[PDB]
Amino acid sequence: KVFGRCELAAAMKRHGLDNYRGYSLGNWVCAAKFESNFNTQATNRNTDGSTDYGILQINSRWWCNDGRTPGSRNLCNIPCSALLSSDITASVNCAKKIVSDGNGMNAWVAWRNRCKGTDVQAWIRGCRL
Amino acid sequence: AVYPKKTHWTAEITPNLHGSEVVVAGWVAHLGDYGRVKIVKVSDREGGAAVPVYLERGKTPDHLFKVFAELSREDVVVIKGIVEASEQYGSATGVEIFPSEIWILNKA
């Protein structure tokens, strides 16, 4: 599914991401935009044998299990397939574990590269939350 | 061949060093592998700084990812890289190191 911006903001807010580990909701929306273009089915294989899955591009080495990445730790205890659905619950539960690992949202390269130090709250402007 | 000499204690790595090459030496306090970003935090004093050394696909030389993969918490390492002043999660310290070399002195 491809989410609308406000539609994803509302869904992230209902899932408790606004100010989760001190990150305001537009951080999460901006991260999804640059990680997946709001597309829940986004799947991207890396040269290292791992693949990133879903709206927040969660990686298969440590975080979810895709059954095909060596050294898989599955810290979110979830198959990567769960991260590809129309519903963001699994991606959110897993993003909360990742953002709590001790580096905040620096775990997402597209958040570092496109969101950090920018007007992140612009991402929720005009949304009726 | 032969690891380089420490130029700075981890506590001396401050935003005012932005753009400078440094060598830090100490133990692996924390490892995070998030796929395209991997972060090794290095400390050299108990109850001290844990300076994050950031590996990013597209930016860090590939060979350093192979070295990251050999790392374990408490390994003793020596890292050469460039200081970057930037906001860190849960710290007022505001620095990271983009590595050009990672040496593993020994495997705790």
Numbering used by the authors:
A (entry chain A): 1 to 129
B (entry chain B): 0 to 107
Excerpt from the publication:
In this study we have designed and tested the properties of a new protein scaffold based on the OB-fold of the aspartyl tRNA synthetase (AspRS) from the thermophile Pyrobaculum aerophilum. Sharing a common range of epitopes centred on the HEL active site, these OBodies were also found to be efficient inhibitors of HEL activity.
With three amino acid substitutions compared to the parent AM1L200 (T19S, M37K and K86E), it showed a binding face that was very similar to AM1L10 and NL8, with differences at the periphery. In a manner very similar to the AM1L10 structure, a small conformational change in R61 from HEL moved its guanidinyl group away from the interface. In contrast to the previous two HEL-complex structures, L4, with an entirely new sequence, was moderately well-defined as electron density in the structure. The loop showed some contact with HEL, increasing buried surface area by ∼100 Å2, although no additional hydrogen bonds or other polar contacts were noted. The L4 residues from AM2EP06 also made extensive contacts with the β-sheet binding face via S85 and Q87, potentially introducing conformational restraints to HEL-binding residues. Similarly, at the C-terminal end of L4 an intrachain hydrogen bond between S90 and T92 also restrained the loop. In this case the exact molecular determinants of the improvement in affinity were less clear, but the most likely explanation seemed to be a change in L4 dynamics through the K86E substitution. Although some role in long-range electrostatic attraction may be hypothesised, we think it most likely that this mutation increased the occupation of binding-favourable conformations of L4 by removing competing interactions with HEL.
